[PDB]
Swiss-Prot record, chains A, B:
It is found in: Cytoplasm. Belongs to the CoA-transferase III family. CaiB subfamily. It catalyses: crotonobetainyl-CoA + (R)-carnitine = crotonobetaine + (R)-carnitinyl-CoA; 4-(trimethylamino)butanoyl-CoA + (R)-carnitine = (R)-carnitinyl-CoA + 4-(trimethylamino)butanoate. Homodimer. It comes from Escherichia coli (strain K12). This is L-carnitine CoA-transferase. The lineage of its organism: Bacteria, Pseudomonadati, Pseudomonadota, Gammaproteobacteria, Enterobacterales. Its EC number is 2.8.3.21. NCBIfam families: PRK03525.1.
Amino acid sequence: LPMPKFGPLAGLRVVFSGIEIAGPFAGQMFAEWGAEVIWIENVAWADTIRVQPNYPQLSRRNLHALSLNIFKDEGREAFLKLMETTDIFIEASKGPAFARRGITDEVLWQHNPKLVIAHLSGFGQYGTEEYTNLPAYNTIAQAFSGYLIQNGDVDQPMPAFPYTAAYFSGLTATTAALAALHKVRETGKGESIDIAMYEVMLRMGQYFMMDYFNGGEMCPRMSKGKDPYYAGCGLYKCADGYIVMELVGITQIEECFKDIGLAHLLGTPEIPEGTQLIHRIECPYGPLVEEKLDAWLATHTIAEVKERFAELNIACAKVLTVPELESNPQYVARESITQWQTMDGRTCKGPNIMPKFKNNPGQIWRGMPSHGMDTAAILKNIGYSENDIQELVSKGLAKVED
Amino acid sequence: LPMPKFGPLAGLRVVFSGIEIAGPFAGQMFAEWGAEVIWIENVAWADTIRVQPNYPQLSRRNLHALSLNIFKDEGREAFLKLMETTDIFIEASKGPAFARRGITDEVLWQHNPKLVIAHLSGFGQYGTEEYTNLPAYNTIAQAFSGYLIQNGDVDQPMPAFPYTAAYFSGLTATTAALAALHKVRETGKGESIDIAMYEVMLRMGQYFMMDYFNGGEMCPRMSKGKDPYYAGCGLYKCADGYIVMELVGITQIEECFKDIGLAHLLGTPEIPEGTQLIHRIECPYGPLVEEKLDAWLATHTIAEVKERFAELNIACAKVLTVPELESNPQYVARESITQWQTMDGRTCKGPNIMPKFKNNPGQIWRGMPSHGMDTAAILKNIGYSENDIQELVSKGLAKVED
Ligand SMILES: CC(C)(COP(=O)(O)OP(=O)(O)OC[C@H]1O[C@@H](n2cnc3c(N)ncnc32)[C@H](O)[C@@H]1OP(=O)(O)O)[C@@H](O)C(=O)NCCC(=O)NCCS
Ligand SMILES: CC(C)(COP(=O)(O)OP(=O)(O)OC[C@H]1O[C@@H](n2cnc3c(N)ncnc32)[C@H](O)[C@@H]1OP(=O)(O)O)[C@@H](O)C(=O)NCCC(=O)NCCS
């Protein structure tokens, strides 16, 4: 398949079957980094992502587009022969959907014993009848893992946004696939990976949930974007706008208390010598600290707080709106936002490849492919004849380039 | 170093230097999956994570604890010899801090030309003077990437929580390190990776930001946990509590419109045949759909909505509180939450290894190590004498087991 040789993953062959974010995000990350990546869409309908006006130009760039019925007759026989040349297969289904349709892990390893198989689902490959085969999206994974209940304001839980759990789940799939890939390169035998979205998100929400599991209470939600436990952390107003700050570290606490008028608190039974952190609930002075911090910050400009906090080594930043990013000097310097050409021949703007590999940078070599774009190319490369692939399209088992 | 042989990453050697979540999360994930992982803390102070009462039992499990001044005299000479046996080194600093302290990539590859180096920072290894050396935490990365501005309610932006950006950044580091690791196993030459937290989070927030970069407007924030654009997606109230649902798909929309009393809308110029999604803003009927959905849902119990939505293949779930997880039958069936023994000999409860590798499951073999726990073991393994490592402790350059 014609493509430039670049990135740490050059010449690795990846195929994924899934829609929206989670599955496709996992597979396309390989493409960002130079792998050969086949996106499989059904033959009758297309990936739901295509309904989004701009995003798919980013999230499906560098891909090859197959369109094949991977479960019906010869359409299946093709998919499985394809699997013989595949290093990694990502699939995102309602539970063990592939297995209950005939394509088990053992059937797959029959065609490629080295194959790394990554199963992405809401609730896992096995469990109970009630949950295992349920459909799932990001919000479902947030709801079921206790992530959603931790987000929002004191009085109003809400999902983390945009579609946060889909990105964590796809990223975990990518990670786990590369880990399994390493094992294949070291023992010569394939692997199957069972990634349940809610288990991913259960992990991502443990910071305070670990307290509940081990004697404690659950923390509340934030109030107005302030950390539920630690004073001086989260969202604050200066005289001229929103900033964030983290009041963490001995030196930071000592010098900041001095600025805001709380010097006399340092060295008390409650704030002894090496205090690195200020717990707002446990501390009688917790609310006083917030009151004085708020008052001191409201006296200063964002720029002045930034200068003083750079002196004290207190992390902070202006809360940037989307219109402010393009022309930020850090963004500009690092080409964090770039441009590329779509397939239709139009100019498209959005994030560059991340992260930056030094010796083998990733690169944007192709825009989002059309539905079925590369089907004929892929089947001829797998060994199907011109007429033989013409029959596949005919019996409805494949969609050719429009 | 004594440890069981398990997981896809058995016999891979990983060292990380960093505190809190991002850096350590990246390194410890290797440990979940069977790698040998050395956590480096400073000799004078310890990782700030240790101030948290329970979480570190999860986030530092399966680790070996070094405590060494990696920048001063012989402390440096040790670190660099250690680097000769290391496959992957994760470091989290204020920008290019290691390089401006003498330990450049070229110095590191001098001691190991194959080494994969992963640099985690707020703002990158290079850029402008204003930003490149700034300290960063999760909230700083959320603020600077336009992630924070997208979270919260219409009237109140807030961070995604808990510390969402630290997990994305550490997960990306893990992923990118394994990708680079693959390249080393295929060309024999090392790699350096520049992971800027804000660039990670810029990527994770593109779903609607891509509209802004390409002609459009930015979406608003959610109202009460409802999707800013798509009707029938996000947080809803039933008669007896919060659920989430995603109204996506032709069949789902058709049958759900029929239930809620909006049948006559199907087939209009605005909702034609294969409509997969309902845009609340663009659609004159968008608000009507919400009103009827809300009213229909408030008539039913969570259990009844679940049953009907399982018939229509509409993804949904009860919003679970933290006290509801342990005894959920899916959690129980998959052992999603487990127990292990700490070093002090106490019983600790929390998430199991995720995800589940089939042939080479990860496993919890050790609790969180104490500050300096394994220093003497590591230095003797690297080739330092008993007296030779006694001198390191003496000149303040290392901390031994308490
Ligand atoms: C997202 C999800 C709900 C969509 O599934 P769905 O609406 O029920 O069904 P699809 O649109 O994928 O297609 C329906 C059927 O066609 C099949 N189909 C999909 N790809 C096919 C292929 N290329 N060839 C033949 N048939 C195919 C599917 O196997 C599915 O089978 P099933 O009815 O036996 O269960 C489901 O894939 C899922 O829960 N995935 C896991 C979590 C996830 O990735 N969520 C979305 C990202 S946020
Ligand atoms: C988190 C962060 C702000 C903390 O840094 P800090 O408070 O300024 O400093 P540290 O507590 O790490 O230590 C201070 C100095 O001691 C050094 N130190 C750290 N580990 C050391 C080691 N084991 N041996 C000798 N010195 C060490 C550091 O290099 C740092 O050097 P510098 O003063 O030249 O810049 C910073 O590491 C950072 O921005 N990291 C990147 C983003 C990140 O990971 N954030 C935290 C997770 S959410």
